Enzyme design. Structure first.
Site, PDB file in Angstrom:
ATOM      1  N   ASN A 126       0.830  -1.208   0.000  1.00  0.00           N
ATOM      2  CA  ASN A 126       0.000   0.000   0.000  1.00  0.00           C
ATOM      3  C   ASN A 126       0.863   1.256   0.000  1.00  0.00           C
ATOM      4  OD1 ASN A 126      -2.474   1.356   0.065  1.00  0.00           O
ATOM      5  ND2 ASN A 126      -2.444   1.509   2.297  1.00  0.00           N
ATOM      6  N   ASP A 142       5.612  -5.016   2.639  1.00  0.00           N
ATOM      7  CA  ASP A 142       4.335  -4.472   3.204  1.00  0.00           C
ATOM      8  C   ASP A 142       3.188  -5.475   3.013  1.00  0.00           C
ATOM      9  OD1 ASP A 142       3.053  -1.993   4.394  1.00  0.00           O
ATOM     10  OD2 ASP A 142       1.858  -2.246   2.546  1.00  0.00           O
ATOM     11  N   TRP A 143       2.018  -5.066   2.501  1.00  0.00           N
ATOM     12  CA  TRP A 143       0.935  -6.038   2.349  1.00  0.00           C
ATOM     13  C   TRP A 143       1.260  -7.112   1.323  1.00  0.00           C
ATOM     14  CZ3 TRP A 143      -2.624  -7.203   5.620  1.00  0.00           C
ATOM     15  CH2 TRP A 143      -2.968  -6.253   6.596  1.00  0.00           C
ATOM     16  N   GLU A 192      10.554  -4.563   5.333  1.00  0.00           N
ATOM     17  CA  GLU A 192       9.469  -3.709   5.833  1.00  0.00           C
ATOM     18  C   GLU A 192       8.120  -4.415   5.692  1.00  0.00           C
ATOM     19  OE1 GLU A 192      10.718  -0.916   8.147  1.00  0.00           O
ATOM     20  OE2 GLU A 192       8.771  -0.534   7.236  1.00  0.00           O
ATOM     21  N   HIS A 209       9.968   3.295   5.231  1.00  0.00           N
ATOM     22  CA  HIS A 209       9.180   2.140   4.836  1.00  0.00           C
ATOM     23  C   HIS A 209       9.445   1.683   3.410  1.00  0.00           C
ATOM     24  CE1 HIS A 209       5.997  -0.757   4.732  1.00  0.00           C
ATOM     25  NE2 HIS A 209       5.421  -0.140   3.714  1.00  0.00           N
TER      26      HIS A 209
HETATM   27 KR   LIG Z   1       3.617   1.083   6.973  1.00  0.00          KR
HETATM   28 KR   LIG Z   2       2.737   2.273   4.435  1.00  0.00          KR
END
Ligand SMILES: [Kr]
Ligand SMILES: [Kr]
Ligand SMILES: [Kr]
Ligand SMILES: [Kr]
Ligand SMILES: [Kr]
Ligand SMILES: [Kr]
Ligand SMILES: [Kr]
Ligand SMILES: [Kr]
Ligand SMILES: [Kr]
Ligand SMILES: [Kr]
Ligand SMILES: [Kr]
Ligand SMILES: [Kr]
Length: 291
Positions: A39, A104-105, A128, A270
Protein backbone atom coordinates in the site's frame (compact mmCIF):
# COMPACT_ATOMS: atom_id res chain seq x y z
CA UNK A 1 20.09 9.20 -10.16
CA UNK A 2 17.34 6.81 -9.09
CA UNK A 3 15.37 5.95 -12.21
CA UNK A 4 11.87 7.37 -12.64
CA UNK A 5 10.86 5.52 -15.80
CA UNK A 6 8.79 2.36 -16.08
CA UNK A 7 10.18 0.63 -19.19
CA UNK A 8 8.13 -2.56 -18.97
CA UNK A 9 5.66 -3.75 -21.58
CA UNK A 10 2.22 -4.40 -20.07
CA UNK A 11 1.01 -7.96 -19.65
CA UNK A 12 -2.55 -8.84 -18.70
CA UNK A 13 -4.22 -12.01 -17.47
CA UNK A 14 -7.85 -12.73 -16.66
CA UNK A 15 -8.29 -13.54 -12.96
CA UNK A 16 -11.72 -14.32 -11.43
CA UNK A 17 -13.39 -12.30 -14.19
CA UNK A 18 -11.10 -9.26 -13.93
CA UNK A 19 -7.96 -8.25 -15.77
CA UNK A 20 -4.74 -8.02 -13.77
CA UNK A 21 -1.62 -6.24 -15.01
CA UNK A 22 1.88 -7.57 -14.47
CA UNK A 23 5.51 -7.02 -15.47
CA UNK A 24 7.09 -10.13 -17.02
CA UNK A 25 10.75 -9.98 -18.10
CA UNK A 26 13.85 -12.15 -18.00
CA UNK A 27 14.43 -15.67 -19.33
CA UNK A 28 11.32 -17.71 -19.89
CA UNK A 29 12.42 -20.79 -17.93
CA UNK A 30 14.10 -21.45 -14.62
CA UNK A 31 12.58 -20.49 -11.31
CA UNK A 32 10.58 -17.24 -11.54
CA UNK A 33 10.98 -14.42 -9.04
CA UNK A 34 7.62 -12.98 -7.95
CA UNK A 35 7.69 -9.37 -6.70
CA UNK A 36 4.76 -8.29 -4.48
CA UNK A 37 4.07 -4.64 -3.63
CA UNK A 38 1.85 -3.22 -0.88
CA UNK A 39 0.00 0.00 0.00
CA UNK A 40 -0.37 2.40 -1.94
CA UNK A 41 2.11 1.27 -4.55
CA UNK A 42 2.23 -1.04 -7.60
CA UNK A 43 4.82 -2.84 -9.68
CA UNK A 44 6.27 0.67 -10.19
CA UNK A 45 7.88 0.19 -6.75
CA UNK A 46 10.11 -2.57 -8.18
CA UNK A 47 11.18 -0.72 -11.33
CA UNK A 48 14.79 -0.17 -10.23
CA UNK A 49 15.18 -3.59 -8.61
CA UNK A 50 13.91 -5.89 -11.39
CA UNK A 51 16.71 -4.90 -13.85
CA UNK A 52 19.29 -6.43 -11.49
CA UNK A 53 17.45 -9.76 -11.47
CA UNK A 54 16.09 -9.99 -15.03
CA UNK A 55 19.47 -10.90 -16.63
CA UNK A 56 19.38 -14.24 -14.80
CA UNK A 57 15.76 -14.96 -13.79
CA UNK A 58 12.19 -14.49 -14.91
CA UNK A 59 10.74 -11.51 -13.03
CA UNK A 60 6.97 -11.30 -12.50
CA UNK A 61 5.52 -8.26 -10.74
CA UNK A 62 1.71 -8.09 -10.55
CA UNK A 63 -0.40 -5.11 -9.61
CA UNK A 64 -2.75 -6.21 -6.84
CA UNK A 65 -6.45 -6.10 -7.67
CA UNK A 66 -7.73 -2.54 -7.52
CA UNK A 67 -4.16 -1.18 -7.80
CA UNK A 68 -1.72 -0.13 -10.49
CA UNK A 69 -3.02 -1.04 -13.95
CA UNK A 70 -5.19 -3.91 -12.71
CA UNK A 71 -8.97 -3.76 -12.90
CA UNK A 72 -11.17 -2.26 -10.18
CA UNK A 73 -13.98 -4.74 -9.44
CA UNK A 74 -16.70 -4.06 -6.90
CA UNK A 75 -15.01 -5.78 -3.95
CA UNK A 76 -14.88 -5.20 -0.24
CA UNK A 77 -11.06 -5.04 -0.76
CA UNK A 78 -10.45 -6.86 2.51
CA UNK A 79 -7.27 -8.91 2.87
CA UNK A 80 -9.11 -12.10 1.91
CA UNK A 81 -10.06 -10.53 -1.44
CA UNK A 82 -6.39 -9.92 -2.20
CA UNK A 83 -5.58 -13.49 -1.13
CA UNK A 84 -8.15 -14.86 -3.57
CA UNK A 85 -6.97 -12.76 -6.51
CA UNK A 86 -3.26 -13.39 -5.94
CA UNK A 87 -3.88 -17.14 -5.55
CA UNK A 88 -5.75 -17.16 -8.85
CA UNK A 89 -3.11 -14.97 -10.53
CA UNK A 90 -0.35 -17.43 -9.63
CA UNK A 91 -2.38 -20.37 -10.96
CA UNK A 92 -3.37 -18.46 -14.11
CA UNK A 93 0.31 -18.00 -14.93
CA UNK A 94 1.01 -21.67 -14.22
CA UNK A 95 3.75 -20.92 -11.72
CA UNK A 96 5.05 -24.00 -9.93
CA UNK A 97 8.06 -23.13 -7.77
CA UNK A 98 8.85 -19.46 -7.11
CA UNK A 99 11.23 -17.14 -5.29
CA UNK A 100 9.33 -14.39 -3.46
CA UNK A 101 10.46 -10.77 -3.20
CA UNK A 102 7.94 -9.05 -0.96
CA UNK A 103 7.12 -5.80 0.86
CA UNK A 104 4.34 -4.47 3.20
CA UNK A 105 0.93 -6.04 2.35
CA UNK A 106 2.69 -7.90 -0.46
CA UNK A 107 4.66 -9.63 2.28
CA UNK A 108 1.49 -10.63 4.15
CA UNK A 109 0.24 -12.08 0.85
CA UNK A 110 3.57 -13.74 0.08
CA UNK A 111 4.16 -15.23 3.53
CA UNK A 112 0.56 -16.44 3.74
CA UNK A 113 0.93 -18.10 0.34
CA UNK A 114 4.26 -19.62 1.35
CA UNK A 115 2.80 -21.10 4.55
CA UNK A 116 0.06 -22.76 2.48
CA UNK A 117 2.42 -23.82 -0.32
CA UNK A 118 5.76 -24.47 1.41
CA UNK A 119 7.09 -26.97 -1.14
CA UNK A 120 6.73 -24.32 -3.86
CA UNK A 121 8.83 -21.54 -2.27
CA UNK A 122 12.55 -21.73 -2.97
CA UNK A 123 13.52 -18.51 -1.17
CA UNK A 124 12.02 -15.34 0.27
CA UNK A 125 13.55 -11.86 0.14
CA UNK A 126 11.61 -9.40 2.24
CA UNK A 127 11.73 -5.91 3.71
CA UNK A 128 9.47 -3.71 5.83
CA UNK A 129 7.00 -6.55 6.13
CA UNK A 130 3.81 -7.09 8.09
CA UNK A 131 4.33 -8.62 11.52
CA UNK A 132 2.10 -8.45 14.61
CA UNK A 133 2.92 -5.09 16.22
CA UNK A 134 2.45 -5.56 19.99
CA UNK A 135 1.66 -1.95 20.95
CA UNK A 136 1.13 1.45 19.40
CA UNK A 137 4.34 2.42 21.24
CA UNK A 138 6.20 0.29 18.69
CA UNK A 139 4.67 2.39 15.91
CA UNK A 140 6.90 5.36 14.94
CA UNK A 141 5.89 8.43 16.89
CA UNK A 142 5.79 10.74 13.86
CA UNK A 143 3.12 8.54 12.22
CA UNK A 144 1.23 7.23 15.26
CA UNK A 145 -1.60 9.78 15.40
CA UNK A 146 -2.08 9.50 11.63
CA UNK A 147 -2.45 5.72 11.54
CA UNK A 148 -4.73 5.78 14.58
CA UNK A 149 -6.85 8.31 12.67
CA UNK A 150 -6.88 6.07 9.59
CA UNK A 151 -8.39 3.39 11.85
CA UNK A 152 -10.92 5.84 13.43
CA UNK A 153 -14.50 5.70 12.10
CA UNK A 154 -15.36 8.43 9.56
CA UNK A 155 -12.08 10.30 10.15
CA UNK A 156 -10.00 7.65 8.39
CA UNK A 157 -12.14 7.72 5.25
CA UNK A 158 -12.06 11.52 5.13
CA UNK A 159 -8.26 11.41 5.23
CA UNK A 160 -7.61 8.52 2.85
CA UNK A 161 -10.61 8.55 0.48
CA UNK A 162 -11.51 12.24 0.35
CA UNK A 163 -8.06 13.83 0.82
CA UNK A 164 -5.85 11.02 -0.60
CA UNK A 165 -3.67 11.08 2.51
CA UNK A 166 -1.96 7.76 1.80
CA UNK A 167 -0.62 8.94 -1.56
CA UNK A 168 -0.01 12.61 -0.78
CA UNK A 169 1.11 12.22 2.83
CA UNK A 170 2.27 8.75 3.82
CA UNK A 171 4.10 7.78 0.63
CA UNK A 172 6.56 10.73 0.53
CA UNK A 173 6.84 10.80 4.34
CA UNK A 174 8.00 7.16 4.36
CA UNK A 175 10.87 7.74 1.88
CA UNK A 176 13.99 9.40 3.28
CA UNK A 177 15.05 11.06 0.04
CA UNK A 178 12.53 13.34 -1.71
CA UNK A 179 10.26 11.71 -4.27
CA UNK A 180 10.11 13.57 -7.57
CA UNK A 181 6.94 14.82 -9.23
CA UNK A 182 7.34 12.23 -12.01
CA UNK A 183 7.47 9.46 -9.41
CA UNK A 184 4.51 10.89 -7.49
CA UNK A 185 2.48 11.06 -10.70
CA UNK A 186 3.15 7.37 -11.36
CA UNK A 187 1.90 6.54 -7.87
CA UNK A 188 -1.07 8.91 -8.22
CA UNK A 189 -2.39 7.54 -11.52
CA UNK A 190 -4.46 4.56 -10.20
CA UNK A 191 -6.16 6.70 -7.55
CA UNK A 192 -7.01 10.00 -9.26
CA UNK A 193 -10.71 9.54 -8.34
CA UNK A 194 -11.89 9.03 -4.73
CA UNK A 195 -14.13 6.11 -5.79
CA UNK A 196 -10.92 4.19 -6.58
CA UNK A 197 -9.38 4.56 -3.12
CA UNK A 198 -11.14 1.86 -1.07
CA UNK A 199 -8.07 -0.44 -1.01
CA UNK A 200 -5.99 2.42 0.38
CA UNK A 201 -8.29 2.71 3.39
CA UNK A 202 -8.92 -1.01 3.91
CA UNK A 203 -5.21 -1.81 4.23
CA UNK A 204 -4.42 0.35 7.32
CA UNK A 205 -7.63 -0.90 8.89
CA UNK A 206 -6.26 -4.46 8.56
CA UNK A 207 -2.79 -3.81 10.05
CA UNK A 208 -2.27 -6.16 13.01
CA UNK A 209 -1.54 -3.75 15.87
CA UNK A 210 -2.17 -4.32 19.59
CA UNK A 211 -4.14 -7.49 18.88
CA UNK A 212 -6.58 -6.03 16.36
CA UNK A 213 -8.17 -6.88 14.06
CA UNK A 214 -8.15 -10.35 15.59
CA UNK A 215 -8.53 -12.22 12.29
CA UNK A 216 -5.50 -10.61 10.64
CA UNK A 217 -3.51 -10.84 13.88
CA UNK A 218 -4.03 -14.60 13.96
CA UNK A 219 -3.26 -15.03 10.24
CA UNK A 220 0.00 -13.08 10.52
CA UNK A 221 0.99 -14.86 13.73
CA UNK A 222 0.46 -18.12 11.86
CA UNK A 223 2.77 -17.30 8.99
CA UNK A 224 5.42 -15.87 11.33
CA UNK A 225 5.30 -19.17 13.23
CA UNK A 226 5.73 -20.97 9.92
CA UNK A 227 8.63 -18.71 8.96
CA UNK A 228 10.44 -19.36 12.25
CA UNK A 229 10.38 -23.14 11.64
CA UNK A 230 11.02 -23.10 7.90
CA UNK A 231 14.44 -23.93 6.43
CA UNK A 232 13.70 -21.83 3.32
CA UNK A 233 16.52 -19.40 2.41
CA UNK A 234 15.63 -15.92 3.62
CA UNK A 235 17.02 -12.46 2.83
CA UNK A 236 16.00 -9.43 4.91
CA UNK A 237 16.69 -5.82 3.95
CA UNK A 238 16.37 -3.25 6.72
CA UNK A 239 17.03 0.45 7.22
CA UNK A 240 17.20 2.99 9.98
CA UNK A 241 14.98 4.06 11.60
CA UNK A 242 12.56 1.85 9.64
CA UNK A 243 8.80 1.81 10.19
CA UNK A 244 7.43 -1.72 10.42
CA UNK A 245 10.86 -3.27 11.02
CA UNK A 246 12.97 -1.06 13.33
CA UNK A 247 16.60 -2.05 13.92
CA UNK A 248 15.80 -3.96 17.14
CA UNK A 249 13.30 -6.07 15.20
CA UNK A 250 15.81 -6.70 12.41
CA UNK A 251 18.24 -7.85 15.10
CA UNK A 252 15.61 -10.15 16.62
CA UNK A 253 14.94 -11.71 13.21
CA UNK A 254 18.68 -12.17 12.61
CA UNK A 255 18.77 -14.24 15.81
CA UNK A 256 15.53 -16.22 15.41
CA UNK A 257 14.89 -17.01 11.76
CA UNK A 258 16.61 -20.04 10.20
CA UNK A 259 18.80 -19.60 7.14
CA UNK A 260 18.59 -15.79 7.13
CA UNK A 261 20.95 -13.30 5.53
CA UNK A 262 20.45 -9.66 6.54
CA UNK A 263 21.43 -6.53 4.58
CA UNK A 264 21.44 -3.07 6.16
CA UNK A 265 20.58 -0.50 3.48
CA UNK A 266 21.40 2.67 5.39
CA UNK A 267 18.80 5.39 5.95
CA UNK A 268 15.32 4.09 5.35
CA UNK A 269 11.75 4.39 6.55
CA UNK A 270 9.18 2.14 4.84
CA UNK A 271 9.61 2.23 1.02
CA UNK A 272 13.22 1.07 1.14
CA UNK A 273 13.15 0.38 -2.61
CA UNK A 274 13.00 4.15 -3.13
CA UNK A 275 16.03 4.89 -0.93
CA UNK A 276 18.55 2.19 -1.99
CA UNK A 277 17.30 0.19 -4.99
CA UNK A 278 20.82 -0.54 -6.23
CA UNK A 279 21.84 -2.35 -3.05
CA UNK A 280 18.55 -4.24 -2.81
CA UNK A 281 18.56 -5.34 -6.44
CA UNK A 282 22.25 -6.24 -6.55
CA UNK A 283 22.06 -8.22 -3.31
CA UNK A 284 19.04 -10.19 -4.50
CA UNK A 285 20.90 -10.98 -7.71
CA UNK A 286 23.94 -12.20 -5.74
CA UNK A 287 21.78 -14.32 -3.42
CA UNK A 288 19.71 -16.14 -6.05
CA UNK A 289 22.49 -18.51 -7.28
CA UNK A 290 22.86 -20.07 -3.81
CA UNK A 291 19.22 -21.19 -3.98
KR1 LIG B 1 3.62 1.08 6.97
KR1 LIG C 1 2.74 2.27 4.43
KR1 LIG D 1 -6.82 -5.15 3.20
KR1 LIG E 1 -1.90 -10.44 -7.79
KR1 LIG F 1 2.89 -15.64 -3.38
KR1 LIG G 1 1.83 -4.21 10.96
KR1 LIG H 1 6.05 -0.73 14.21
KR1 LIG I 1 3.62 10.15 8.37
KR1 LIG J 1 -14.01 4.54 -2.11
KR1 LIG K 1 18.59 -5.69 19.85
KR1 LIG L 1 20.22 -7.26 11.61
KR1 LIG M 1 15.45 -13.40 18.73
Amino acid sequence: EIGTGFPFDPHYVEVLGSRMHYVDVGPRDGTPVLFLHGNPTSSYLWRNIIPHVAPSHRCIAPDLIGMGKSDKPDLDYRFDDHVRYLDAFIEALGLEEVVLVIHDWGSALGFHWAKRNPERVKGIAFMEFIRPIPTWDEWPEFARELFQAFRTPDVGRELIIDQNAFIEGILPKFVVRPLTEVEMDHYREPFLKPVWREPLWRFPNELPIAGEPANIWALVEAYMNWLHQSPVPKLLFWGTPGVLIPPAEAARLAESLPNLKTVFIGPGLHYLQEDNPDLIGSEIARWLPAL
